[PDB]
Amino acid sequence: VYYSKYLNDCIMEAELHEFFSRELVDAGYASCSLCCVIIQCAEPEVVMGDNHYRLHKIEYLLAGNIWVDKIIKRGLSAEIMVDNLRAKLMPIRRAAYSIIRTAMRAGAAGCEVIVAGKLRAQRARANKFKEGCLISTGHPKRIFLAEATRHIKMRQGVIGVKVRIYNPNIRGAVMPDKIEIG
Protein backbone atom coordinates (compact mmCIF):
# COMPACT_ATOMS: atom_id res chain seq x y z
CA VAL A 1 0.00 0.00 0.00
CA TYR A 2 1.87 3.01 -1.41
CA TYR A 3 -1.27 4.71 -2.66
CA SER A 4 -2.82 6.52 0.29
CA LYS A 5 0.03 9.00 -0.10
CA TYR A 6 -0.60 9.61 -3.78
CA LEU A 7 -4.40 9.73 -3.47
CA ASN A 8 -4.16 12.37 -0.75
CA ASP A 9 -1.83 14.28 -3.07
CA CYS A 10 -4.60 14.18 -5.70
CA ILE A 11 -7.30 15.40 -3.30
CA MET A 12 -5.04 18.21 -2.06
CA GLU A 13 -4.27 19.24 -5.64
CA ALA A 14 -8.05 19.50 -6.04
CA GLU A 15 -8.05 21.63 -2.88
CA LEU A 16 -5.44 24.03 -4.20
CA HIS A 17 -7.15 24.45 -7.58
CA GLU A 18 -10.57 25.17 -6.08
CA PHE A 19 -9.15 27.56 -3.48
CA PHE A 20 -7.27 29.36 -6.24
CA SER A 21 -10.54 29.55 -8.19
CA ARG A 22 -12.18 31.17 -5.18
CA GLU A 23 -9.31 33.60 -4.55
CA LEU A 24 -6.95 34.36 -7.47
CA VAL A 25 -9.95 35.49 -9.55
CA ASP A 26 -8.31 38.93 -9.53
CA ALA A 27 -5.31 37.87 -11.64
CA GLY A 28 -6.71 35.35 -14.12
CA TYR A 29 -6.22 31.96 -12.53
CA ALA A 30 -6.28 28.98 -14.88
CA SER A 31 -4.83 25.85 -13.25
CA CYS A 32 -2.04 24.49 -11.04
CA SER A 33 0.24 21.45 -10.81
CA LEU A 34 1.59 19.65 -7.74
CA CYS A 35 5.18 18.44 -7.37
CA CYS A 36 6.95 22.67 -5.52
CA VAL A 37 3.71 23.96 -7.07
CA ILE A 38 3.93 25.31 -10.62
CA ILE A 39 0.98 27.46 -11.66
CA GLN A 40 -0.61 28.36 -15.01
CA CYS A 41 -1.83 31.97 -14.79
CA ALA A 42 -2.57 34.97 -17.01
CA GLU A 43 -0.39 37.61 -15.36
CA PRO A 44 2.30 36.77 -12.78
CA GLU A 45 3.22 40.41 -12.17
CA VAL A 46 0.43 40.93 -9.61
CA VAL A 47 0.33 37.46 -8.03
CA MET A 48 3.87 38.47 -7.21
CA GLY A 49 3.22 41.86 -5.67
CA ASP A 50 5.92 44.29 -4.78
CA ASN A 51 8.61 42.46 -2.78
CA HIS A 52 6.89 39.05 -3.20
CA TYR A 53 5.15 39.59 0.18
CA ARG A 54 1.79 38.22 -0.99
CA LEU A 55 3.36 35.21 -2.74
CA HIS A 56 5.28 34.25 0.40
CA LYS A 57 2.15 34.80 2.48
CA ILE A 58 0.33 32.35 0.19
CA GLU A 59 3.12 29.75 0.44
CA TYR A 60 2.87 29.97 4.20
CA LEU A 61 -0.90 29.66 3.91
CA LEU A 62 -0.05 26.34 2.20
CA ALA A 63 1.40 25.06 5.49
CA GLY A 64 -1.63 25.21 7.76
CA ASN A 65 7.97 26.69 -3.53
CA ILE A 66 5.38 28.42 -5.74
CA TRP A 67 6.52 29.19 -9.28
CA VAL A 68 4.34 30.50 -12.08
CA ASP A 69 4.38 30.23 -15.89
CA LYS A 70 2.54 32.51 -18.33
CA ILE A 71 -0.49 31.88 -20.52
CA ILE A 72 1.02 32.83 -23.88
CA LYS A 73 -2.36 32.94 -25.69
CA ARG A 74 -4.88 34.54 -23.35
CA GLY A 75 -7.94 34.14 -25.55
CA LEU A 76 -7.57 30.42 -26.25
CA SER A 77 -8.31 29.48 -22.63
CA ALA A 78 -11.95 29.08 -21.74
CA GLU A 79 -11.19 29.98 -18.07
CA ILE A 80 -9.73 33.48 -17.87
CA MET A 81 -12.09 34.49 -20.71
CA VAL A 82 -15.16 33.12 -18.92
CA ASP A 83 -13.94 35.18 -15.95
CA ASN A 84 -13.88 38.05 -18.48
CA LEU A 85 -17.57 37.42 -19.24
CA ARG A 86 -18.15 37.36 -15.47
CA ALA A 87 -16.67 40.85 -15.43
CA LYS A 88 -18.65 42.26 -18.35
CA LEU A 89 -21.89 40.78 -16.95
CA MET A 90 -23.35 45.99 -20.52
CA PRO A 91 -25.23 44.40 -23.43
CA ILE A 92 -25.24 40.64 -23.91
CA ARG A 93 -24.72 40.62 -27.68
CA ARG A 94 -21.72 42.94 -27.57
CA ALA A 95 -20.23 41.33 -24.46
CA ALA A 96 -20.31 37.84 -25.95
CA TYR A 97 -19.22 39.00 -29.39
CA SER A 98 -16.13 40.58 -27.86
CA ILE A 99 -15.70 37.28 -26.00
CA ILE A 100 -15.74 35.51 -29.37
CA ARG A 101 -13.61 38.07 -31.23
CA THR A 102 -10.72 37.91 -28.78
CA ALA A 103 -10.58 34.13 -29.15
CA MET A 104 -10.92 34.24 -32.93
CA ARG A 105 -8.01 36.69 -33.22
CA ALA A 106 -6.06 34.66 -30.64
CA GLY A 107 -6.38 31.70 -33.00
CA ALA A 108 -9.49 29.74 -32.08
CA ALA A 109 -10.90 27.80 -35.01
CA GLY A 110 -14.29 27.64 -33.36
CA CYS A 111 -15.92 29.46 -30.49
CA GLU A 112 -19.30 30.03 -28.93
CA VAL A 113 -21.04 31.29 -25.80
CA ILE A 114 -24.28 30.32 -24.03
CA VAL A 115 -26.19 32.50 -21.54
CA ALA A 116 -29.25 31.73 -19.43
CA GLY A 117 -31.11 33.77 -16.84
CA LYS A 118 -33.86 36.30 -16.14
CA LEU A 119 -32.85 38.58 -18.93
CA ARG A 120 -36.23 40.13 -19.72
CA ALA A 121 -39.37 40.14 -17.60
CA GLN A 122 -39.17 37.51 -14.84
CA ARG A 123 -38.42 34.64 -17.25
CA ALA A 124 -35.27 32.68 -17.97
CA ARG A 125 -34.45 32.15 -21.64
CA ALA A 126 -31.20 31.10 -23.28
CA ASN A 127 -29.06 32.99 -25.77
CA LYS A 128 -26.44 31.23 -27.88
CA PHE A 129 -23.92 33.25 -29.86
CA LYS A 130 -21.45 31.47 -32.05
CA GLU A 131 -18.69 31.76 -34.64
CA GLY A 132 -16.84 29.13 -36.66
CA CYS A 133 -16.65 25.35 -36.44
CA LEU A 134 -17.25 23.20 -33.36
CA ILE A 135 -17.53 19.48 -32.53
CA SER A 136 -19.05 17.60 -29.61
CA THR A 137 -18.56 13.83 -30.07
CA GLY A 138 -16.17 11.04 -29.19
CA HIS A 139 -12.73 11.04 -27.66
CA PRO A 140 -11.36 14.22 -29.39
CA LYS A 141 -13.94 16.23 -27.46
CA ARG A 142 -11.69 15.79 -24.42
CA ILE A 143 -8.51 16.85 -26.25
CA PHE A 144 -9.36 19.70 -28.57
CA LEU A 145 -12.63 21.08 -27.26
CA ALA A 146 -12.63 23.19 -24.10
CA GLU A 147 -15.70 24.02 -21.99
CA ALA A 148 -16.06 26.28 -18.97
CA THR A 149 -19.15 27.37 -17.05
CA ARG A 150 -19.73 30.04 -14.41
CA HIS A 151 -22.51 31.21 -12.10
CA ILE A 152 -23.00 34.96 -11.73
CA LYS A 153 -24.55 36.51 -8.61
CA MET A 154 -26.59 39.17 -10.38
CA ARG A 155 -28.60 41.94 -8.74
CA GLN A 156 -31.64 39.99 -9.91
CA GLY A 157 -31.43 36.21 -10.34
CA VAL A 158 -28.31 34.16 -11.04
CA ILE A 159 -26.82 34.27 -14.55
CA GLY A 160 -25.23 31.14 -16.05
CA VAL A 161 -22.61 31.58 -18.77
CA LYS A 162 -20.66 28.97 -20.75
CA VAL A 163 -17.65 29.56 -23.02
CA ARG A 164 -16.66 26.80 -25.44
CA ILE A 165 -13.50 27.04 -27.57
CA TYR A 166 -12.41 24.59 -30.28
CA ASN A 167 -8.74 24.29 -31.30
CA PRO A 168 -8.05 21.41 -33.74
CA ASN A 169 -4.57 22.90 -34.23
CA ILE A 170 -2.13 22.55 -31.37
CA ARG A 171 1.48 21.37 -31.40
CA GLY A 172 0.55 17.76 -30.73
CA ALA A 173 -1.54 14.94 -32.21
CA VAL A 174 -3.42 14.94 -35.50
CA MET A 175 -7.20 14.64 -35.72
CA PRO A 176 -8.15 11.18 -37.07
CA ASP A 177 -10.38 12.80 -39.69
CA LYS A 178 -8.19 15.33 -41.45
CA ILE A 179 -5.95 13.41 -43.86
CA GLU A 180 -3.79 15.88 -45.79
CA ILE A 181 -2.93 14.15 -49.07
CA GLY A 182 -0.21 15.69 -51.23
Binding site: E15, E18, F19, R22, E23, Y53, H56, K57, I58, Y60, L61, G64
Partner: protein, 83 residues
Protein backbone atom coordinates in the same frame (compact mmCIF):
# COMPACT_ATOMS: atom_id res chain seq x y z
CA UNK B 1 -13.48 40.41 26.99
CA UNK B 2 -13.19 36.81 28.22
CA UNK B 3 -9.51 35.80 28.52
CA UNK B 4 -6.66 38.22 27.91
CA UNK B 5 -4.30 35.23 27.41
CA UNK B 6 -6.65 33.64 24.86
CA UNK B 7 -7.00 36.92 22.96
CA UNK B 8 -3.22 37.37 22.94
CA UNK B 9 -2.32 33.83 21.76
CA UNK B 10 -4.73 34.25 18.84
CA UNK B 11 -2.83 37.38 17.81
CA UNK B 12 0.46 35.52 18.42
CA UNK B 13 -0.28 33.31 15.46
CA UNK B 14 0.22 36.51 13.36
CA UNK B 15 3.87 37.17 12.49
CA UNK B 16 3.60 40.92 12.16
CA UNK B 17 6.21 42.07 9.65
CA UNK B 18 6.80 38.45 8.60
CA UNK B 19 4.33 36.48 6.46
CA UNK B 20 2.55 33.75 8.46
CA UNK B 21 -1.12 33.20 7.57
CA UNK B 22 -4.06 31.69 9.46
CA UNK B 23 -6.68 29.03 8.66
CA UNK B 24 -9.64 27.73 10.66
CA UNK B 25 -11.29 24.31 10.40
CA UNK B 26 -14.56 25.25 12.24
CA UNK B 27 -15.33 22.06 14.14
CA UNK B 28 -17.95 23.91 16.24
CA UNK B 29 -8.83 18.10 19.69
CA UNK B 30 -11.42 20.66 20.84
CA UNK B 31 -8.39 22.96 21.13
CA UNK B 32 -6.71 24.48 18.08
CA UNK B 33 -3.85 22.74 16.29
CA UNK B 34 -1.73 25.91 16.27
CA UNK B 35 -1.52 26.65 19.99
CA UNK B 36 -3.99 24.77 22.18
CA UNK B 37 -6.82 27.18 23.08
CA UNK B 38 -10.29 26.14 22.09
CA UNK B 39 -11.77 26.47 18.61
CA UNK B 40 -14.55 28.46 20.29
CA UNK B 41 -12.18 31.09 21.67
CA UNK B 42 -10.67 31.41 18.21
CA UNK B 43 -14.05 31.59 16.46
CA UNK B 44 -15.81 34.21 18.57
CA UNK B 45 -12.96 36.71 18.16
CA UNK B 46 -12.28 35.96 14.48
CA UNK B 47 -15.83 37.13 13.71
CA UNK B 48 -14.92 40.52 15.20
CA UNK B 49 -11.59 40.63 13.38
CA UNK B 50 -13.56 40.07 10.17
CA UNK B 51 -15.92 42.94 11.04
CA UNK B 52 -13.01 45.27 11.78
CA UNK B 53 -10.88 44.30 8.81
CA UNK B 54 -7.68 43.63 10.71
CA UNK B 55 -7.80 40.55 8.44
CA UNK B 56 -9.77 39.48 5.35
CA UNK B 57 -11.03 36.03 4.35
CA UNK B 58 -11.91 33.66 1.56
CA UNK B 59 -13.34 30.17 2.05
CA UNK B 60 -12.84 26.73 0.48
CA UNK B 61 -14.08 23.31 1.71
CA UNK B 62 -15.23 24.14 5.24
CA UNK B 63 -11.90 25.85 5.90
CA UNK B 64 -11.67 29.55 6.71
CA UNK B 65 -8.65 31.16 5.04
CA UNK B 66 -7.46 34.55 6.26
CA UNK B 67 -4.92 37.06 5.05
CA UNK B 68 -3.49 40.07 6.87
CA UNK B 69 -3.79 43.60 5.55
CA UNK B 70 -1.72 46.76 5.88
CA UNK B 71 -4.11 48.54 8.24
CA UNK B 72 -4.65 45.37 10.28
CA UNK B 73 -0.92 44.90 10.79
CA UNK B 74 -0.84 48.55 11.84
CA UNK B 75 -3.53 47.76 14.42
CA UNK B 76 -1.48 44.85 15.73
CA UNK B 77 1.64 47.05 16.05
CA UNK B 78 0.15 48.59 19.19
CA UNK B 79 -1.49 45.41 20.51
CA UNK B 80 1.92 43.68 20.57
CA UNK B 81 3.99 46.84 21.26
CA UNK B 82 6.48 46.02 18.49
CA UNK B 83 8.21 48.60 16.28
Amino acid sequence: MVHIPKAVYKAVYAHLYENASLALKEYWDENGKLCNPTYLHVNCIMQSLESRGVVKDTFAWRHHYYLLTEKGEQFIRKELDLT
